[PDB]
Design a protein around this nucleic acid. Structure first.
Ligand SMILES: [Mg+2]
Ligand SMILES: [Mg+2]
Ligand SMILES: [Mg+2]
Ligand SMILES: [Mg+2]
Ligand SMILES: [Mg+2]
Ligand SMILES: [Mg+2]
Ligand SMILES: [Mg+2]
Ligand SMILES: [Mg+2]
Ligand SMILES: [Mg+2]
Ligand SMILES: [Mg+2]
Ligand SMILES: [Mg+2]
Ligand SMILES: [Mg+2]
Ligand SMILES: [Mg+2]
Ligand SMILES: [Mg+2]
Ligand SMILES: [Mg+2]
Ligand SMILES: [Mg+2]
Ligand SMILES: [Mg+2]
Ligand SMILES: [Mg+2]
Ligand SMILES: [Mg+2]
Ligand SMILES: [Mg+2]
Ligand SMILES: [Mg+2]
Ligand SMILES: [Zn+2]
Ligand SMILES: [Zn+2]
Ligand SMILES: [Zn+2]
Ligand SMILES: [Zn+2]
Lengths: 196, 89, 57, 151, 48, 229, 61, 129
RNA sequence: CCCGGGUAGUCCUGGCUGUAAAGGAUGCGGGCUAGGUGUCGGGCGAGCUUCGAGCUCGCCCGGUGCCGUAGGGAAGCCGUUAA
RNA sequence: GAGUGGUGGCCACUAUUAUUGGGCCUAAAGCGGCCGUAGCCGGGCCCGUAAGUCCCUGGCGAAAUCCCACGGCUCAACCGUGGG
């Protein structure tokens, strides 16, 4: 039914949005509280995580790029790349990484994962130019422009980002057949998150 | 009004000194041993008039248009410029 | 023979030579190819797989 | 927009589309005509009669019944009053505007320096003359009728 | 400025009057029709 | 076509590609020019065009549209720069336009030719004139427009044998694309050559934006890219 | 959807507290609504929706 | 104020197609708008359409398919004779048989191709291509 | 130009004059074409409340600002308060 | 090229007169503001009329001048017989 119980989703704060809203995000929004804060629907998150796990398992592993400027997302993307074999770029994204072949670390992926369209704007801009599919994590305040596959979640919290990337890595492993069952994946969620 | 005035049968170039046109016309003048430019221009005009009649007859319809259409083809094959089975295009 | 010009899955217009379009296999089933033109991507138009019926960006 | 002030207000009524009277309305046409005559004899305007009928008697507009005499048309309050001889001699909107203009003119006799209110009198009299042109065209006013404040 | 006017099917007279009115703003047209050059030419219109 | 085939062979074997599309071309997974368009690829290596369309390196298929010298002011005098506008094509259905800069004319010419290749486009050709309905790809298939700066350009289908009724810059560009006859109308400052050329190039590109039906393809003789007898 | 205009007001079936008479009245009046039998007040008008002083029995279509 | 219901409808359709709308509502309806829509549907420029009844002059709901380059009214409504269609085609259309001019005749509303086949003139009211 | 004085005028009543960078340097009416975020008036819903014509959040209509997508423009820039 | 230059005029160039087809925030250009007469432009449905409008057919708009084919001057310019 669910990849994890809804209690863990709620305790990790996946459903907590922001005081701002956007017209194209309303298909994912569940309700608004009395203090003006918008809440996300968690069943949609589970469905999109399953679909995203199926989509990403079909690409060649070293052709996947994951990025995260925001500090609370840096350890999760590094751990995701270590587990799945995907390239991972935490911190400042050097302009021209995907458009300037003369640069030392020039790299053209086949698919890109964006932690936040607002903060990772340089990576998204360069990815539009080279015509690859874009997968993104979207909060209540984000727009859906140039997003080809959207995953609705809180993308600012430490525990939520840890949980999202942990689930996504497990789904990829299960879908490509490197683990024969879900129970086999014995890597705790706490290893994806930043400490202190 | 004004009575009739007899008009030139040939047209002059819109600009006297264009390099490409000068080269092309010099080649023609040398090859066919024509006496002056106007002689060449005369023949050019004849060609233009033929094309202008075909362009007008393609976009026409009715009874006089057909008669004119067949007269143009007949005259062109009498002069030997088209074979016996040619069409308007 | 000649070649076929690709057509956007959402709106059905042809893809022009140098626009910022994209194409990918269906995320849900993987049996069909989705094309999205620059205008549909910019406005976040929804799309629907012609085989399994899963819809949306 | 508003004829002179050029504002774009939108408030108004939102009538649902329907043909017959609703099932829950029990009054017949004869009761409704009797009510209209009684209210008019109490001294109300045609707009006020409809307001009272809607608010107190639960009657959405009388324009839900066919005219018992002429099947070509529906019933209106003015048509009902005409059928009994109690219809206004001057059209009501013109009458209300003329009444507003008379009150304002005696204010201006005592306040000759109140120029902003005078422009209001000018606008009101423009409205009055538009209406008199329309009504003479339709034959609801005699051809010799004229508007003169000194009357 | 709104749409250029008049565009109506039965507004021929006004359109013609508009074109006539603003043609006098063209100094070429005004000088020819009023014959201003002839009025001041010492050669009286001659080429030599 | 015997020369440029071996030129393409020579370029291919001594070339080490630095981009993904260049690798697809190097390994024989792409063999035709039409396969690089309409999928969002970034084109950053000039060797791609040299292998797939080798005839853009001929002298008859290149035109230097204009050369200007521009000035930057300093406390030690005037610093001079060259700007070159150039175009290339295959005279069938592919055309490109580029701008180059340099301290000497030759550097600017080299860079301008290089950028024209990288800006290559494919167009549509046909016959749409009321007074010539011949289904051959000698003109534009229908009326189109383009613009740049103050310049507006409108291109109109013309009869076979008319010639190119347009200013000289437009003549050169249209000839490189493989079009023989056209009518035209312009607004704005055509003496600004950079803008004139860009407006014509945009008009040619815009033949891809008109919606058409299968019936229309037969009626106007529409051809995409090479005529391909 | 909202192409057709639909009102936000309603007609209500109410019962007088004092007389016991039953009536049908409008929810957004512009006058004081009084009982058709005894004359007691049933709805007081305001800027928008009226203040109902009677017992509401049914909301009519 | 409102002067021309048909011009509003066609400008509305051309604005909507440029941003990828899948349907539109034409707010003041009339019989002439209905005839124009029937002709547009016959040549494949629109999908299904339906009349919706308010208490007012009615509404049209129309399905769009992204097949319209441009559409607009012709003002004033010029009269035209049965053998004079070509110059109007060159005025409003991009190639010799590209698109349709919509004509009001005493035999009804029809495309200029059908009217030319019947041998009749009329009044120009719209163009679509 | 700065400093010490100073007539007309600046103020009220009844008239005349009809001029300003009287500038939003942008004539007026109607239909249509992504969003986001403040603020003023009215209405509706919900929750608080010291029960106040009080406070907080959301939505509709009409005013008044800012950022900005398509499109426009020589550009500065305008962008449902359209240029 | 038996011609080729100078001076003055009209058309084009010129979408620098704009019906087709131009402009008016900062470049020439929105009356300081508003009310309203003539004129122009005007919401949906049903029935009648037939002035505008479209189609068919009678009587007219001299000849010369213009376009096409054929014929006579060696061909042509020119002139005749037919069609427009
Ligand atoms: Mg005489
Ligand atoms: Mg210095
Ligand atoms: Mg530009
Ligand atoms: Mg100019
Ligand atoms: Mg003093
Ligand atoms: Mg002031
Ligand atoms: Mg100011
Ligand atoms: Mg002014
Ligand atoms: Mg408020
Ligand atoms: Mg105000
Ligand atoms: Mg507002
Ligand atoms: Mg802005
Ligand atoms: Mg101008
Ligand atoms: Mg003004
Ligand atoms: Mg007025
Ligand atoms: Mg009407
Ligand atoms: Mg008649
Ligand atoms: Mg004659
Ligand atoms: Mg002889
Ligand atoms: Mg002869
Ligand atoms: Mg003769
Ligand atoms: Zn699309
Ligand atoms: Zn599928
Ligand atoms: Zn042709
Ligand atoms: Zn009672």
């Amino acid at each position: 039914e669910y990849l994890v119980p809804l209690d863990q989703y709620l305790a990790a704060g996946v459903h907590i949005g922001t005081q701002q809203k956007t017209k194209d995000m309303k298909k994912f929004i569940y309700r608004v509280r009395q203090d003006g804060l918008y809440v996300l629907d968690v069943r949609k998150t589970d469905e999109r995580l399953k679909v995203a796990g199926k989509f990403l398992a079909r690409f060649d592993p070293q052709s996947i790029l994951a990025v995260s400027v925001r500090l609370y997302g840096q350890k999760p993307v590094k751990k995701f790349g270590e587990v799945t074999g995907a390239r991972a770029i935490p911190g400042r994204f050097l302009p021209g990484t995907m458009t300037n072949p003369a640069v030392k670390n020039f790299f053209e992926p086949d698919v890109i994962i964006i932690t936040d369209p607002r903060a990772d704007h340089q990576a998204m801009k360069e990815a539009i130019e080279i015509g690859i599919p874009i997968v993104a994590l979207v909060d209540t305040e984000n727009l859906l422009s140039y997003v080809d596959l959207a995953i609705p979640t809180n993308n600012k919290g430490r525990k939520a980002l840890a949980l999202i990337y942990w689930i996504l890595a497990r789904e990829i492993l299960y879908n490509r057949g490197e683990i024969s069952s879900r129970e086999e994946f014995k890597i705790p969620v706490e290893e994806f998150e930043m400490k202190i | 009004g004004d009575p009739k005035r007899q008009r030139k049968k040939y047209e002059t170039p819109p600009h006297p000194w264009i390099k490409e046109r000068l080269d092309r016309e010099r080649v023609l003048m040398d090859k066919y041993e024509l006496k002056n430019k106007k002689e060449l221009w005369k023949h050019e005009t004849q060609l233009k008039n033929f094309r202008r009649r075909a362009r007008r007859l393609l976009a026409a319809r009715g009874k006089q248009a057909e008669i004119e259409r067949e007269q143009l083809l007949a005259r062109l094959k009498r002069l030997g410029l088209l074979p016996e089975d040619a069409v308007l295009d | 023979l000649k070649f076929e010009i690709p057509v956007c899955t959402s709106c059905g217009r042809e893809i022009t030579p140098r626009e910022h379009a994209t194409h990918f296999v269906c995320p849900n089933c993987g049996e069909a190819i989705i094309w999205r033109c620059e205008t549909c991507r910019l406005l976040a138009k929804p799309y629907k797989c012609p085989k399994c019926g899963w819809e949306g960006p | 927009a508003r004829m002179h002030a050029r504002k774009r207000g939108k408030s108004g009524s939102k009538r649902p589309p329907r043909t017959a009277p609703p099932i829950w309305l029990e009054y017949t046409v004869e009761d409704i005509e009797n009510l209209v005559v009684k209210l008019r004899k109490e001294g109300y305007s045609t707009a006020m009669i409809g307001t009272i009928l809607r608010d107190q008697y639960g009657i959405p507009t009388v324009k839900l019944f066919r005219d018992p005499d002429n099947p070509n048309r529906k019933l209106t309050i003015t048509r009902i009053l005409e059928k009994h001889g109690l219809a206004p001699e001057i059209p009501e909107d013109l009458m209300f505007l003329i009444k507003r203009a008379v009150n304002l003119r005696k204010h201006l006799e005592q306040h000759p320096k109140d120029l902003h209110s005078m422009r209001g009198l000018q606008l009101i009299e423009s409205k009055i003359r538009r209406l008199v042109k329309y009504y003479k065209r339709k034959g609801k006013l005699p051809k010799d009728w004229r508007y003169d404040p000194e009357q | 400025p709104g749409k250029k006017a008049p565009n109506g099917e039965f507004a021929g007279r006004k359109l013609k009057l508009k074109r006539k009115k603003f043609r006098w703003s063209d100094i070429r047209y005004k000088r020819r029709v009023l014959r201003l050059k002839e009025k001041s030419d010492p050669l009286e219109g001659a080429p030599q | 076509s015997q020369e440029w085939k071996e030129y393409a062979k020579r370029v291919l074997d001594e070339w080490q590609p630095k981009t993904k599309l260049g690798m697809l071309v190097k390994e024989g997974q792409i063999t035709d020019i039409h396969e690089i368009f309409r999928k969002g690829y970034q084109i950053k290596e000039p060797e791609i065009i040299d292998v797939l369309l080798p005839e853009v390196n001929a002298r008859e298929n290149q035109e230097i549209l204009d050369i200007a010298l521009t000035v930057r002011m300093t406390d030690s005098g005037r610093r001079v720069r060259f700007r070159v506008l150039a175009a290339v094509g295959n005279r069938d259905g592919y055309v490109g336009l580029g701008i180059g800069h340099g301290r000497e004319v030759g550097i600017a010419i080299r860079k301008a030719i290089n950028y024209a290749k990288l800006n290559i486009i494919e167009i549509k050709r046909g016959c749409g004139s009321w007074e010539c309905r011949c289904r051959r790809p000698h003109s534009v298939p229908f009326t189109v427009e383009g613009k740049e700066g103050s310049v507006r350009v409108k291109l109109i289908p013309g009869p076979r044998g008319l010639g190119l009724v347009i200013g000289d810059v437009g003549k050169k560009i249209l000839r490189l694309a493989g079009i023989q006859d056209v009518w035209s109308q312009t607004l704005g400052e055509t003496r600004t050559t950079v803008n004139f050329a860009k407006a014509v190039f945009n008009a040619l590109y815009n033949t891809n934006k008109v919606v058409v039906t299968p019936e229309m393809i037969e009626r106007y003789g529409i051809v995409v890219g090479r005529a391909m007898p | 959807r909202n192409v057709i205009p639909m009102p936000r007001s309603r007609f209500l079936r109410v019962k007088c507290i004092d007389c016991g008479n039953e009536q049908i009245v409008f929810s957004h009046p512009a006058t004081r609504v009084r009982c058709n039998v005894c004359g007691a007040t049933l709805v007081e008008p305001t800027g928008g929706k009226g203040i109902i002083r009677a017992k509401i029995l049914e909301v009519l279509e | 104020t409102l002067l021309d219901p048909l011009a509003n409808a066609l400008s509305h359709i051309t604005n909507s197609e440029r941003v990828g709308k899948r349907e539109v509502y034409i707010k003041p309806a009339s019989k002439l708008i209905g005839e124009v829509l029937r002709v547009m549907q016959k040549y494949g420029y629109i999908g299904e359409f339906e009349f919706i009844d308010d208490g007012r002059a009615g509404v049209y709901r129309v399905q769009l398919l992204g097949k319209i380059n441009k559409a607009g009214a012709i003002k004033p409504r010029f009269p035209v004779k049965a053998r004079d269609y070509e110059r109007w085609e060159k005025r409003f259309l991009p190639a010799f048989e590209f698109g349709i001019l919509i004509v009001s005749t005493s035999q009804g509303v029809m495309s200029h191709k059908e009217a030319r086949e019947k041998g009749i003139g009329g009044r120009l009211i719209a163009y679509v291509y």
